[PDB]
Curated annotation (Swiss-Prot):
Entry-linked SUPFAM superfamilies: Periplasmic binding protein-like II (SSF53850)
Compartment(s): Periplasm
Protein name listed in UniProt: Maltose/maltodextrin-binding periplasmic protein
Pfam families: SBP_bac_1
Matching InterPro entries: Maltose/Cyclodextrin-bd, SBP, SBP_1_CS
The organism's taxonomic lineage, starting at the top: Bacteria, Pseudomonadati, Pseudomonadota, Gammaproteobacteria, Enterobacterales
Keywords from the UniProt entry: Periplasm, Signal, Sugar transport, Transport
GO annotations of cellular component type: ATP-binding cassette (ABC) transporter complex; ATP-binding cassette (ABC) transporter complex, substrate-binding subunit-containing; maltose transport complex; membrane; outer membrane-bounded periplasmic space; periplasmic space
GO biological process: carbohydrate transport; cell chemotaxis; detection of maltose stimulus; DNA damage response; maltodextrin transmembrane transport; maltose transport
Keyword Transport: yes
PROSITE patterns named in the record: SBP_BACTERIAL_1
Gene Ontology molecular-function annotations: carbohydrate transmembrane transporter activity; maltose binding
Job of this protein: Part of the ABC transporter complex MalEFGK involved in maltose/maltodextrin import. Binds maltose and higher maltodextrins such as maltotriose.
PANTHER family registered for this protein in UniProt: MALTOSE-BINDING PERIPLASMIC PROTEIN, MALTOSE_MALTODEXTRIN-BINDING PERIPLASMIC PROTEIN
Length: 388
């Protein structure tokens, strides 16, 4: 029963309940119902469902996915006037431009930070290199040094990029998809450090988002790596935590990929004007962002008037410090292939099924191949064998 309502998709780690509250206010004033959903793998489902009755009117995701959506014709060009554009930071609009056109509304700037338990660890490590020794000390006390999601390359990228890894070479506003940097010396060093941590029993190759979060919020591990959305669950656990700069590697800052959470409008929605009214007049206001932020923190928001309030938060300062040491994600269509390729490399290397060099060599080859994700799905289905 989605006909005649605004349907919104947003990731399940974000403040979907707070977003729903904004939706209730919109409905109160306009009579238009707003249904917020948080399907799994929504970023992969969108292209499969956008044209159907199950497609959302509005989709929230980091800006990196939107170029591929726009290439496929799945997103409407948005039409904010100059007065509205002036309300958000200019660099956030840049993140949602594709072939010269605005294709989403920027919401917040997300970057990973080091999150640490101040009771277990008053002075967090400045370097990745000191982490093995630190884990040894904590293991003796029945604790561990560090746990974070090893199944999503988003979380390992800061380390892979620290000493020189890169996705696609950038020059003069353009990315060269033939110049991939996931298999250079810097990338190799980072992933090798990670794999060594696993070989030496300082981390488990199977650690995922849930496992790491439970471990940190139960006080079992001294550190985790995560974004602003995770601060809320840590609050509930009453763990005394700090949010700080990521450790350095080979004396170089970890360099997270920075995402701008953005709201795109489905090109097939018959309610694009209403979606625009909701996004500009309800969500992107102090009251709207406050409701979402109160649910799960957004990070550094794109709306100047509300960032003015949040800027005093030292956790946001750390977020922006890590963000500025990192790099903005490209939004080119090839990003989906790059992410899948790197995800495969990290997982195969961590589990020991491939060496670092083999894994990253394959990642480089596959990073521009658009068929990689679909080919991945086929492998999971195994397939049959003929009698002849
Ligand atoms: O791991 C690859 C993945 O990274 C980014 O996804 C982030 C997302 O930006 C965050 O908002 C949060 O939800 O965590 C995700 C990682 O689990 C890219 O945006 C995404 O396209 C990419 O697949």
């Amino acid at each position: 029963i989605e006909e005649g309502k605004l349907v919104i998709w947003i990731n399940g780690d974000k403040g979907y309940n707070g977003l729903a509250e904004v939706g209730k206010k919109f409905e109160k004033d306009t009579g238009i119902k707003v249904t917020v959903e948080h399907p799994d793998k929504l970023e992969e489902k969108f292209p499969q469902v956008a044209a159907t009755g199950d497609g959302p009117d509005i989709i929230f995701w980091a800006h990196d996915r939107f170029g591929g959506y726009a290439q496929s014709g799945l997103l409407a060009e948005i039409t904010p006037d100059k007065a509205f554009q002036d309300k958000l930071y200019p660099f956030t609009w840049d993140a949602v431009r594709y072939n010269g056109k605005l294709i989403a509304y920027p919401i917040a700037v997300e970057a990973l930070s080091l999150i640490y338990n101040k009771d277990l660890l008053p002075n967090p490590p400045k370097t990745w290199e000191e982490i093995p020794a630190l884990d040894k000390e904590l293991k003796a006390k029945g604790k561990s040094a560090l746990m974070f999601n090893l199944q999503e390359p988003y979380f390992t990228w800061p380390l892979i990029a620290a000493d020189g890894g890169y996705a696609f070479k950038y020059e003069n506003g353009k990315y060269d998809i033939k110049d991939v940097g996931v298999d250079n010396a810097g990338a190799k060093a980072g992933l090798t450090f990670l794999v060594d941590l696993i070989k030496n029993k300082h981390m488990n190759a199977d650690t995922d988002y849930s496992i790491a979060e439970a471990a940190f919020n139960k006080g079992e591990t001294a550190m985790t790596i995560n974004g602003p959305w995770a601060w809320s669950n840590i609050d509930t656990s009453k763990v005394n935590y700090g949010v700080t700069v990521l450790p350095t590697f080979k004396g170089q800052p970890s360099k997270p990929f920075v995402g701008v959470l953005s709201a795109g409008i489905n090109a097939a929605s018959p309610n694009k004007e209403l979606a625009k009214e909701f996004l500009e007049n309800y969500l992107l206001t102090d009251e709207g962002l406050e409701a979402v932020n109160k649910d799960k923190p957004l990070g550094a928001v794109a709306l100047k008037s509300y960032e003015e309030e949040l800027a005093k938060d030292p956790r946001i300062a750390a977020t922006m410090e890590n963000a500025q040491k990192g790099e903005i994600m490209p939004n080119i269509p090839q990003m989906s292939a790059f992410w899948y390729a790197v995800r495969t490399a990290v997982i195969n290397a961590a589990s020991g099924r491939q060496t670092v060099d083999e894994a990253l060599k394959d990642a480089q080859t596959n990073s521009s191949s658009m068929d990689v994700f679909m080919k991945g799905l086929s492998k999971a289905k195994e397939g049959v064998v003929a009698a002849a």
